[PDB]
Amino acid sequence: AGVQCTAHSWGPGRAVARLPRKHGGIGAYANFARGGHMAHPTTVIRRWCRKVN
Amino acid sequence: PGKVFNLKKGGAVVRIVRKKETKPHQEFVKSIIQECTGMAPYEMHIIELLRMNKDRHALRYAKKRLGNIKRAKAKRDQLSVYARN
Amino acid sequence: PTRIRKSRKRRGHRQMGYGRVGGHRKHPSGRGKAGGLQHKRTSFDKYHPGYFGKLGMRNYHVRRNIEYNPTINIDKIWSLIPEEQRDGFLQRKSTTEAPVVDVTRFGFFKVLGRGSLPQCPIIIKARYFSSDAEKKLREVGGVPLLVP
Amino acid sequence: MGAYKYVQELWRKKQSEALHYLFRLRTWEYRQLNAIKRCSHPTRPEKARRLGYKAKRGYVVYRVRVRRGGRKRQCVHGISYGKPRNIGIVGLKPSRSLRALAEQKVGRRLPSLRVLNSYWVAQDGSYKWYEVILIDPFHPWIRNDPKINWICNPVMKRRECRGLTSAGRKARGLHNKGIGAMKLRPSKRAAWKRNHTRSLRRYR
Amino acid sequence: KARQIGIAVDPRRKNKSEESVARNVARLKEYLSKVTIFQAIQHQGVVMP
């Protein structure tokens, strides 16, 4: 989720912020962009159970 | 150490000693085949060395050809019988 | 639980305890254990003597069940006898009906000598003895024995 | 006894005058033919029976010629880029033996048959010749015969492509057991994946 | 014959001593007593633990 598109930074010199952008210039691939991945996605390897003697 | 130390080892049970474990037909086949083939070229070289009493040279040459000392000793012994005259 | 953690008490503080002058960067010392002989030498000599180098013979394959060797002291021997029987044995310090304790059945090989025994004859069968385990046992009237 | 005990004894004397002459006439002839060729009958009938051949309808034999020597990498202008441990071009050795390569070449040419086994027949300075046994699995003599109709079942398609023949088994290391072989028994990939797995249990 | 009435047979194993035989012959002898060959009871778990 969030990483099926193609996006790369434009770099400095074009008067825009440095995040990855889709072809056309749309923000992508950051947690602060509409449509990007989570900063730290949830995973099922969380320890769900607990032990008791 | 490859054993565990204890005196009286084996003192509780009685062990079973298994039997330790020719074929004149095979010797007969080799004698017919030997008759219509002869020996290999390396084997003929060894016989010539053995006739001249260069025993250590014969062993060196057989180790170089065969690559294993027990087989090289078994071959030079095998070839002396035809190399005595 | 996330709701009792120290990190949630830093909302509104610009920098979550990592400082303004220094800051929080990726790997300012390198990754892992690197640097132990150069720029972490003050750490490695203070807390880890004998981390660098070689020492002693090597064995290309150790046999774990050959080198295994359990041991028991003489002060633990009488606890192998069940409690229902200990009183009677102490009562009659017999030379002709002394208790026999075979320690391999309980899973020990050698008998060492820390401690002391009660004043009561007893027979101990094992695979090896230390010199003062034997000495304290013969002091009591006991005998050592070797077993298969 | 029978006759094949003498033939086996004879083939253990390849340096003799007799077999030196016959080995010479065969390499001259095989040099005059194509790389893959159908044979009427096995050139070595006793070795063919040792490996499972039977003179029935549905067994066939082809002779395969392969080239001798080492391996050269397919790198344009002889340039490997990258790290210096990976720079070599000539002087390498193939992972599979020449016997296994012979079976794979004839399986690709004849994909409607089943490869069984193979054996050596000749060599010279540039080539080795092997013979390959193949079974047609839709012939009724093959299908109705309990001795061979294991190969009529479909998990036996293109065996030489999957490393299941005897020469293909040797390159995977499977002629060994015990110490020195504990990391290859299902597969080299399978033992790696089993040994590197993180198993996160519920009551960890 | 023994495979037929439920005994596993391993011809690759060899006995190392005389006690190994007596302990297992007594185990074979006992099982042949408690076996019937044709409202019948099916035995659960390992037989003679």
Add this chain to the structure above:
RNA sequence: AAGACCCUUUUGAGCUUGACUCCAGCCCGGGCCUGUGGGGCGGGGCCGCCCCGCUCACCCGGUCGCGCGGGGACCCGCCCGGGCGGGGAGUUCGGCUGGGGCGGCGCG
């Protein structure tokens, strides 16, 4: 227009060579491929070399196989060994310092 000059970063890339470590390719030697004969030199008490016939392997040409040749057990190929090798590959090119460099060395 997050200086392109200048400096710093244990960030690069193009180019060069007497940087460091190497690779193709080429040259050289023995071996196997590999027949069947004749000779000379030397050594040690059988071994090493070298030379020259034949044709049958192997190789090349002419021909619409229309009335034919040339080479030859040497060359090629393969295995191992030695030399040449910025044509090409990867990487490095200290620090202090009244900015850096030249110089100097309170760098032990």
Add this chain to the structure above:
RNA sequence: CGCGCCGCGGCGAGCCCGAGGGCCCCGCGGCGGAGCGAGCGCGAGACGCCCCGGGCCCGCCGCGCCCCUGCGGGCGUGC
């Protein structure tokens, strides 16, 4: 997920919902219990509310002396 330290619960020379089998029942290792020595290997009681220090005992390195089963045992001395 691994390592260190601190707090609280249960049991304590013991402790333990492995895997598996019949929120309940049964369930091996393991870790702790003895250390030291490259290794052959040898192997701890003597004191003390607690803490700190002293003294002594075990192993590794050295060395008087006596002896049986002997380059093995015993009894000592020293960093």
Add this chain to the structure above:
RNA sequence: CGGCCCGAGGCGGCGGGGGCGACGGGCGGAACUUAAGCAUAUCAGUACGCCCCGGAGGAGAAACCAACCGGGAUUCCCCG
């Protein structure tokens, strides 16, 4: 003139070829990255490229492990 051997063209019945974002088998095979630099090492016997099956596949009835008062084909789980 027939036989056997080694080949050629045709005819009949039957079989093969292609397809899949997983699992499985066989080959070829990186570099970023880490080492606070960088060549051995690591990343990784991974990405990716080619070939081949099945409902599973592969493996398998010792030219095995051991050193015991011994076990006994293959696969999978717990344990170090």
